[PDB]
Design a protein around this nucleic acid. Structure first.
Lengths: 81, 187, 48, 95, 96, 108, 80, 94, 105
DNA sequence: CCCGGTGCCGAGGCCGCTCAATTGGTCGTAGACAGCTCTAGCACCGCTTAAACGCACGTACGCGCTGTCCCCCGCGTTTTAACCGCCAAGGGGATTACTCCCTAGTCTCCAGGCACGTGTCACATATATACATCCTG
DNA sequence: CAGGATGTATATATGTGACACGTGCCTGGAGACTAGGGAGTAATCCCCTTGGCGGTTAAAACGCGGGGGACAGCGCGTACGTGCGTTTAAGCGGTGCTAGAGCTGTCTACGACCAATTGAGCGGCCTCGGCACCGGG
């Protein structure tokens, strides 16, 4: 697909900032947040697809994502059975 | 002595809103695009595509970075768009194309009630004596998607070619079904 | 309550008496193994 | 309303709930976009996509929590791009 | 033809009900709880393995696990876990 | 044989000592595992679980809820001093965050 | 004992120079001393925890390396 | 004395292969040995984790390849994978 | 007769790597090509770092790799930097860099 | 900072021994591969509508400037101890002797993990007044 | 120093999702009971690497002075927030289809394993030369 990073709109980023405590947001903060989220997803999904291809599987399971997040340091509970 | 030919199609679609918008006075939506003629991944050799619009827009110089390259926008008048395709290899001269943004239908097409307006043209990018890297990129192009790839303009003719199958099958199915159901209920 | 008890006590009893006669075999083995340990003590005096 | 009251209201509202702040259908398409660049015709589980969205939201919440302090450090209430840039640099992502 | 997957939910609920008679737990909370158990199990076991490899020992023992717990758990949680483990290892070897 | 007693019951724990020992012995951790290692590991895990469950139940009662949800886990972890340090680099799904609004961004 | 003042103002200033600072505040030294004390306390606690299990009367650079690896501050140069 | 062991000889040989005239000091040699040991530990741990994930009781060349992919950044991964695959292919032919 | 290192064309000790893999508790069965592959990757990384440090020390009129130039290479190479990010090279120093704001003029 | 002289101890090359790597040979078992299937992922289309997009307006926050007051910065002289060598001896490690703990195998047996249906048992969504909780006067 | 005018709680309710609870299955586990292995505990004891003595200058420290940097006050401008209206595609759940993850069944090459042989590596030792140190340009 293409240009799906724009599926993270200004209201969504502003809610994500409200949940983080930010009160006032600038204009370019939305572009910065989109770029950072894209860079993070790139690495996470690269690790996930590396765990998938090695398993000769065609579906990216949740354990692959869990292992990718563990590698990146973002241990995630709730999806490990 | 190496010549590589890449077939592409560049054009624009337009949809009429049915009435002039009060917010900005625009009457049509339009999407301007470059896409490959073959089912191939342009991103293997295209770095970016820049589209230069008419000076009425807040920014006329738009950019796209992934195939099928396209921009969706709104307008009320026709103008010439300059599409500058840049290749990954900086030593290769980018291609320049001029597309006449068509938004209004002809009398013949207006009478036919067609829901969309399209203007697109076929071209072939010719790389003569390209660099080793550029040659490898052009030769290593992969398939874009597993699905079919198709062309639209003459939109009225393509729509008629589609309907010549669609309405035939629909009518056959409808009549056959009606006959089956009525005979079965009569018994 | 009591039906399962007898069935359990039977398997336990045959298990209990079982392990009893069992350590009995190990004990007799331990007597032959006791003589072998005395032989090992003789070998340890040899080594000293 | 005064600029800031309806914003502190939303702050207190979204620091109370736990639902996802990013829309599923738009985020799954971004996930499939980023996966296309690694494998063609790749399948994803709903649980995997939800875990990805949760990780992304938690990471962005932490990033904005750090950016808030980066902005307050300069006696500013609005977060600017250099704030997120300093956050990333001191985190070690773009040092 | 069944594909049965194991988990710690049967004992995580027993401990839950014994430390809180009136409070329950949802399925998502139970899954997060099992994930936490697995993560800390991996951490402590890997730390004990590292200690054994450093001491040039091919077997992990209660002492390696104790030092691993002391290293992992912080401050006033380390002491609690260590006292619990010590008391359990002494009530287990006493044939009770 | 005699009535078989499980190691978990013998020690006084609830977590599966047998499964912990199986994992330890077949895993990367070591060649062979002693009988005391899995008991200690299971006891420590059970203690951590009891602590975090107590905190989550307290948070649930505070929020007026009978079922512990990931909110009650996140709040408990980020309110506790030592559990926060233990799980600092761990994210919990649908757990949320704390209402920690900086004093500088309040009405003046 | 209280010999934490061994990390003096000139030493902290040279550390700041190496870190690229060209001007230090008046209250930076007492904060750097506490930060260094906490970092030490942690690393030395891990080292002593390793040494106790090792049953050695002497703390070793190997134990220091293990403590640093546990804290995430991997160090090269001392056999690890 | 004991027998502490290191890759010093092979590190020196690779140093001669890359720079025939540039030597290396003892501190640098020890640092390189420590780096090699740490990379070995990390790659082997990642391979064992991959084996445990795939429920394989063995660490194979494919596991090592995937562990190197999961650790080296980009071009470094692409070059190390090529080196490993070429080495294994040349080994299998003898 | 023939060492597996020379057989595969490598300089690193394929045999020592296999021994360390099978004795490090990493797995119950070490593949035939796993140690060869690991030794090849280690040799590649070692050659990279040694070449960089060599030509970093030779850039300073020296003819002997030192920790200073090892650190310089590790921190100037963007790949090796991401690799050894949280690693500290003893006696390596830091990179010469003064912020423009601190700089005069 | 760069250049020519001296100098020394640490780098690098040789000797020799041994213990790990290698060669040869066996068993078996995890795996590679084909066969079957049934779930779940994919695609699509319509009714509903909540969220998003665009624009207007002004209010308050960024940001630029200025001024004071001081709190570090550079330099000189004054005081403390870090640093570089000898000398016991206290420990870290070789060497030998030996036993409690675990391994391995084989039955016997308690226990938990689902397939299924049944009966309770939260709290999400909905509704409303009570309470703040503003903000323009 | 209020009050429309919003927004935010607070409490109550109910019925559909989900914990919660039998009913029997069994197969993977959990433990008991012999037999065999083995590595580390324990006691010495030889041998380096600590910890402890007296000097030497080099760095830490104390002071001084003024200078440039922090912090506060203030004002200009604009952009970021909020509200209203128009627009769009997001959520729902209803249907259709097949792709492959998964279970399964069979046959097999690869590696652990064990024993004997061989040379690669490593402690050790010595000779030597690359760079530490230094004083003039």
């Amino acid at each position: 697909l293409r240009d799906n990073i724009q599926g993270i709109t200004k209201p969504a980023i502003r809610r994500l900032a409200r949940r983080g405590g930010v009160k006032r947001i600038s204009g370019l903060i939305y572009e910065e947040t989109r770029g950072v989220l894209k860079v993070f997803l790139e690495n996470v999904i690269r690790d996930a697809v590396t765990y998938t291809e090695h398993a000769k599987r065609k579906t990216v399971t949740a354990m692959d994502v869990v292992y990718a997040l563990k590698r990146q340091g973002r241990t995630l509970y709730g999806f490990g059975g | 002595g190496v010549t590589i030919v890449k077939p592409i199609v560049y054009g624009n679609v337009a949809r009429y809103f049915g009435k002039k918008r009060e917010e900005d006075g625009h009457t049509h939506q339009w999407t301007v695009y470059v896409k490959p003629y073959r089912n191939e991944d342009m991103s293997a050799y295209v770095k970016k595509i820049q589209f230069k619009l008419h000076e009425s827009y807040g920014n006329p110089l738009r950019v796209v970075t992934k195939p099928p390259y396209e921009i969706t926008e709104t307008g009320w008048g026709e103008f010439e768009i300059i599409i500058k395709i840049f290749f990954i290899d900086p030593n290769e001269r980018p291609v320049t194309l001029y597309h006449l943004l068509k938004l209004f239908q002809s009398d013949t097409n207006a009478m036919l009630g067609k829901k969309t307006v399209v203007s697109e043209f076929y071209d072939e990018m010719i790389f003569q004596d390209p660099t080793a890297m550029m040659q490898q990129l052009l030769t290593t192009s992969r398939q874009l998607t597993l699905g079919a790839y198709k062309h639209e303009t003459e939109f009225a003719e393509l729509e008629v070619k589609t309907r010549e199958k669609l309405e035939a099958a629909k009518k056959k199915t409808s009549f056959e079904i009606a006959e089956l159901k009525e005979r079965l209920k009569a018994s | 309550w009591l039906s399962a008890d007898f069935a359990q006590e039977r398997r336990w009893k045959r298990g209990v008496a079982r392990k009893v006669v069992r350590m009995v075999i190990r004990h007799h083995e331990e007597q032959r193994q006791k003589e072998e340990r005395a032989r090992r003590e003789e070998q340890a005096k040899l080594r000293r | 309303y005064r600029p800031g009251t309806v914003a502190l209201r939303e702050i207190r509202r979204y620091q109370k709930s736990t639902e996802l702040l990013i829309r599923k259908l738009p985020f799954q398409r971004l996930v499939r976009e980023i996966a296309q660049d690694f494998k063609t015709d790749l399948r994803f589980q709903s649980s995997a996509v939800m875990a990805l969205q949760e990780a992304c939201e938690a990471y962005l919440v932490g990033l904005f929590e750090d950016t808030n302090l980066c902005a307050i450090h300069a006696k500013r209430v609005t977060i600017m791009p250099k704030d997120i840039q300093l956050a990333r640099r001191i985190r070690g992502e773009r040092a | 033809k069944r594909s049965r997957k194991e988990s710690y939910s049967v004992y995580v609920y027993k401990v839950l009900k014994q430390v809180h008679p009136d409070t329950g737990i949802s399925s998502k909370a139970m899954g997060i709880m099992n994930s936490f158990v697995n993560d800390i199990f991996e951490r402590i076991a890997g730390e004990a393995s590292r200690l054994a490899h450093y001491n040039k020992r091919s077997t992990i023992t209660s002492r390696e696990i104790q030092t691993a717990v002391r290293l992992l758990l912080p401050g006033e949680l380390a002491k609690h876990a260590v006292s619990e483990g010590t008391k359990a290892v002494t009530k287990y070897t006493s044939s009770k | 044989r005699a009535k078989a007693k499980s190691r978990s019951s013998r020690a006084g724990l609830q977590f599966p000592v047998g499964r912990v020992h199986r994992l330890l012995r077949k895993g990367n951790y070591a060649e062979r595992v002693g009988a005391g290692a899995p008991v200690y590991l299971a006891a420590v895990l059970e203690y951590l679980t009891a602590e975090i469950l107590e905190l989550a139940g307290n948070a649930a009662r505070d929020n007026k809820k009978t079922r512990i949800i990931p909110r009650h886990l996140q709040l408990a972890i980020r309110n506790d001093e030592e559990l926060n340090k233990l799980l600092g680099r761990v994210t919990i799904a649908q757990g949320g965050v704390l209402p920690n609004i900086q004093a500088v961004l309040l009405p003046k």
